[PDB]
Symmetry: C4
Subunit: 432 residues, 4 copies
């Protein structure tokens, strides 16, 4: 009976904190006197995993089944509709009982009023079979067309599909690290494919209800008596050619329901393609930002060069210095060491340094190693004046190899990475 | 008589300041000797609310009424034009008297010269009925076509509609918080729909004035003697197919007014669709910026990892530390507490802290609570050396539960959020 | 004779500095022994103003004059070509003598070698009349077509037009403040219009050289014997329909020069329209950046709210505080006062402050006024504890009106903007 | 035998460091007991330079050779296929032996398992001639069509081409400074051209296998018995018209393989063009960032002006100050001097300063020159009060010329750039 309560996962510990907050939430669920269903429990997961599959199945199969087929009295179609109505009614019954993340777990007052205020009507319309009631209660062709238009009320399950998809993918940013633009662009691709699939069925459906006039494209292309696969292929081609702004037929369209459907599909396709270009741009601009911020910083540097009118050899020397200091990449070594915790910084220092001070109290050694600084030099650029202590990591130094010190005229022969521990910090560590 | 003066609203207090500045502005309006109209008063609001509705009504109805209908001597059309001319003349009379935000409320000198210099001519042209004067003063078909082209001068009210819309939506950024890109993109959508509606009427209007030559599309499609709804539908379809860059008919266009109108509508549609893509991109890039700045910062962090060639276990340990420190979100807790005022920071501290120091002078307690710091640790990462005081918010610590202190070998067993009050700040508070 | 030397303008003082650097540059021009022409002088300006007009005139008139007209032996055409050849030869002669901004004013060595290395050949080809030489030196229709293809070598003046336009608009960023994206987008619009105008003439030119085969569109549309205006209109419509990716005719194109010209114009139009979308996006993203950085900062603030799980009343109180502190706008008052000079800051302080300290040594007053700080409070938020001095700019305070002080239980009744001069800074000013 | 080992280049010194790390890597390659091939050596470079040329040659020639030609038994075709199979088998043999940058140079364990896990199958399929085996082992037209479909398995060499191109261009960001967006956009242009070239051959290939039905476009346009150049031109035109979303023929397509190929090419072309717009936008936004950050900063400055309601003369004075301080360009002179090394800063100071202190111990002079600060003033803005030392670089000062000092009422007549060395720093240098 603990399936209604939230368990102890990585997600529950990231949301609530320690195990004590999770046990407080479990006692809070068990304290409201009901069979209350917590929205992070396993039961909602196992239920919505079934419901998303049934939603995708219905939203793909139902327009093709309504429009293209002739006799709607086949047995597996009726079985399919009855089972879909049963599950989408039980999901409404459980939506009476679930918790709402704003977590409002008060069953008799908060959940009922919040569900009746926001999303009861759309789920109630999309749940029950409306057409079969009118068939039991009740010029037969007008009745059949009216029942087809009533049976197209099943497509209001998209408002539930969007809600459950947004809930699960809002959960799954915390269990796993995900790029946001990828999630947004695949959500948009799914929406675009679903809209194109609906426009195909709609552009066959509208000449269908008029008993195929001689002006429509179906009668012109002489394709009334083919199979449903051929008709679906041509209708989907027509819908995709209107959606991607192509230009379909020989003539301009003649009938009045053709013109307005054409214009509607053109507007929907143009807006969807504009949002697709926007998501593609937002995804491309976040691939190599570390190689872009360095470029902007070097633009500012050469602007500083141009403001003071420096000679050309000095400018190419600055260029070589930044190439061998940052290596085409932007990072701030002060703030990164500022943000971290202390023994993890001790680990990073014990990896990088603390092997160069092997020659000549461990806590004294760690304090000296924390008191260091990183420097990059250049050949010809001599560092000492005749009349601050260094260590050598790389490069050549003439007055040597990797690893030495200058105990208190030294010229750099190549690119050298050095360290420094200048005597004020050393005296502070001696005081410690 | 106080309707001409600005009242005391949320907007007036955000603009001018206290009530004293508002009373100074009211005395300034009452001191200029006139019936001067202040541009933030209620009278301009109640006037422009009527004028925007009349502008939308005229700019939708008038091209359809001029082009498609045959006899323009129906009585309600003349009544509609007379009432529109009356209101758009009275609006000119009141635009002589209004104040101008640059607020220049000097009536006889500043307002008259500024209005005559900038926008008197366009409002004067779009105000008066030009066609009826030529009809009273004055080959009859050329006269009727000339009066239609003169009656198309009513469409210079768009320059007033743009001005009033920009004034009100510049006001309504301060009464309510609004995203800027939403306002920009709905302004562009309104402009695009209005331009498409005008291109439809224009592409029926140009074959209309030539007594329908046999080369034009109206004579080819055999649609001279249909109703005006059918003709408007086909003309709007042709205009939208040129605007969205489709490709309309079987043949290339033949007549010379067809080719240049076609090219003009193609260029206008291409530029409008490019600006729509630009606004859509600018709106998409401002949805999840807090989830993007964290991504860029972590790119810089892993670049810092790659610059010093750290081992893989240390890199995944940094990754886990940032996941459980920032939780996929960028914020700077130092600058946010820097920007705020002092007792509001005392409120935030009294909510978060000041319950953990419940065990063991209230001002002393508030000073100690302001002297705290926030820390996040990791399991295995022990924090103390044998031979600074902490508090526990979450996690487990072995040598415990949530809430304890280390009064002056402690190992973190899980993710722990701790506090710190190191003895220098404590001695400063003891000095206070 | 001083027209060859740079004068004293706003631009010369912004580039070189004081008048002494300008006089050094004038002596440098007069010291190189030549009639050397400095590239910032008035003579190059007055010369290039003529040359840009002749370039636009030639690059518009010459393709229409070559392709559509039949007899090329009219007198004003020959006069026009002779005068154009004369001016574009004299411009080459002066390009031997001008200075080069890299300013290299050394005449006999630097300028000649740099001009012969980079851009001598293209200007030499586009300068001289090539076709008339072949006409004097030399199946007549092949000769006429060959002279037309040789006379199309005049269109290599675009490489000079681009160079002079970039030089002048690089100059005119410093004389006047200009948005960069506006300059870029109008340069692109000019290039796109010129390319479309060339594609029209080219798509009439290619069927022209083949003596109008029956497969081409000119023979199909029966438009060989119309005037040149009709043919230019249809050719430009065909070129613009290929460029904006429309779909032109009934059939697919049949001949082989039609297909490759069609594909070439489609590729050029697609790339130009993509760069136009890019420039439009870059222009839109730089209109309301100050209203966007505030939005991003408030996203970070509400993220900081969500990280610590604050109550709702505190969150809306932070929201009201930022609305009445920054007013939907981002600025940093510390760094702006950091960047400025000292007496200008004294001017800003003497405007804002120094009227509130009117009640109760002027240098002492200026030091106290520099030692102030700006604060914003909130109603209910009382500021003093029973048992730092303030000034009042706005709001109401109960224990008052605008302008008072607290000389060393005060409750804010409304939004209050206050000042502060806490006693350490006051003691430092007393020490001064 | 040292060609398998990495040599000493600029790239090897930038990657590994000094010469000692390179010699350690050479001893590491020579210590694994094999003929192991290091992935940065010269041998992989000289091998992949041949392999990229063979890949481009095969991926251009093979679809045109399979589809359009009739008899595939010509001798140079068989020689070409045999040589291509030989080289792409030897490349597999060497891919067994190469090192893998993750550098894993362990031959018998790491490389074999990593290559068998990731990319053995695709290279094995694309290496061997599959069709000739079925021809040796084995209604003849079905056999010929089946061998053509088997011989189209050679096009899985694109997965190797992408890998080698990404490896070399990841190497060549470090040998030379390159803009990233240029590399990305030319990679995308190459991919788009290759996909269009494949769609042309595919849209001729599909009617080819059906023995040219009368519904297809080849039989309609009466182009079965032309040469292969004409057929390739029309097929590539059809593929490019579907890819750029044009609208190709008179009728809608009739056959079922036509419709789905048409829709597939439309979707691929739309996605490629959207990514091209994204790369073009990302390239345009990185051209003039230094002229954009100044614009954003000045927006913040004028917002700070509007927040405090400053007079207009003060606002234009701030505008003139920023124009003559930053010159339309953003840079931070403190952080740039912070990032650099010390003797290079001494070089920059010795260029800019140290000529103005020529009048009135060299180390003392360098310390005073490091203790300076840069200031910009304005005419009318007098700087001294009657009752800090300066130097003059430009401008005029009345109580002069360029270069003077104020040894401890001076009015600036023009724009002046000055220096400062205020007495605390001078006393510190005297202490040094
Ligand atoms: C070291 O431990 C491991 C680390 C990493 C891994 C690899 C695990 N992988 C990490 C990336 C996410 C992926 C699956 N995922 C989640 C489920 C889901 C469901 C959706 O339907 C609502 C959805 O809607 C768009 C989007 C998504 C997003 C999504 O992609 C699982 C395995 C590990 O060990 C097993
Ligand atoms: C707690 O107090 C409340 C807080 C919040 C609310 C919700 C109030 N809502 C907040 C958002 C704006 C909206 C209406 N709005 C303003 C009027 C207008 C007119 C225009 O024509 C010129 C226009 O042109 C584009 C654009 C707009 C923008 C616009 O959308 C009103 C109610 C509250 O209590 C009643
Ligand atoms: C208070 O003093 C004043 C302040 C301000 C003004 C308004 C003066 N205005 C300021 C904006 C620029 C404009 C003209 N301009 C320069 C000439 C040019 C030539 C080009 O051809 C190469 C070009 O190529 C794209 C682009 C441009 C850009 C361009 O627009 C002149 C007047 C004032 O007093 C007179
Ligand atoms: C002062 O010393 C010099 C400084 C500068 C120079 C100019 C040298 N130049 C600098 C820019 C890169 C260019 C060639 N380059 C590298 C090779 C390659 C191969 C590719 O195939 C995989 C590729 O795939 C997209 C992309 C690229 C990128 C690319 O453009 C060489 C010369 C110098 O002296 C000789």
């Amino acid at each position: 009976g603990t399936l209604l309560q939230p368990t102890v996962n990585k997600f529950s510990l990231r949301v609530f904190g320690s195990h004590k907050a999770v046990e407080i939430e479990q006692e809070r669920v068990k304290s409201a006197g009901a069979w209350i269903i917590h929205p992070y429990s396993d039961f909602r997961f196992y239920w919505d995993l079934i419901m998303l599959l049934l939603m995708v199945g219905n939203l793909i199969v139902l327009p093709v089944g309504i429009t293209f087929f002739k006799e709607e009295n086949s047995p597996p179609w009726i079985v399919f509709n009855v089972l879909s109505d049963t599950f989408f009614l039980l999901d409404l019954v459980l939506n009476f009982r679930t918790g709402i993340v704003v977590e409002i777990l008060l069953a008799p007052r908060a959940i009922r009023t919040r569900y009746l205020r926001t999303w009861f009507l759309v789920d109630l319309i999309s749940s029950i079979p409306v057409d079969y009631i009118f068939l039991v209660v009740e010029r037969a062709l007008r009745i059949v067309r009216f029942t087809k238009i009533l049976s197209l009320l099943r497509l209001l399950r998209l408002s539930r599909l969007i809600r459950y998809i947004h809930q699960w993918e809002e959960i799954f940013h915390m269990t796993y690290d995900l790029a946001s633009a990828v999630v947004r662009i695949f959500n948009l691709i799914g929406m675009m494919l679903l809209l194109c699939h609906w426009d195909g069925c709609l552009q066959f459906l509208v000449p269908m209800l008029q008993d195929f006039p001689p002006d429509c494209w179906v009668s012109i292309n002489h394709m009334v008596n083919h199979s449903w696969g051929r008709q679906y292929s041509h209708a989907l081609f027509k819908a995709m050619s209107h959606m991607l702004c192509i230009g379909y037929g020989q003539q301009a369209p003649v009938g009045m329901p053709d013109v307005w459907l054409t214009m509607l599909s053109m507007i929907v396709g143009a807006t969807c393609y504009a949002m697709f270009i926007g998501h593609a741009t937002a995804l491309i601009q976040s691939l190599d930002s570390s190689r872009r911020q360095y470029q902007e910083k070097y633009k500012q540097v050469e602007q500083y060069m141009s403001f003071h009118k420096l000679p050309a050899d000095t400018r190419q020397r600055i260029h070589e210095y930044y190439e061998h200091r940052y290596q085409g990449k932007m990072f701030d070594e002060e703030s990164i060491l500022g943000e971290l915790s202390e023994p993890l910084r001790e680990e990073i220092i014990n990896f990088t340094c603390r092997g160069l001070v092997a020659h000549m109290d461990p806590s004294f050694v760690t304090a000296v190693l924390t008191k260091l600084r990183f420097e990059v030099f250049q050949p010809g650029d001599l560092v000492v004046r005749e009349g601050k202590m260094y260590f050598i990591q790389h490069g050549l130094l003439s007055v040597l190899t990797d690893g030495s010190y200058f105990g208190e005229s030294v010229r750099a022969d190549t690119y050298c990475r050095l360290y420094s521990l200048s005597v004020d910090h050393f005296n502070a560590v001696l005081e410690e």
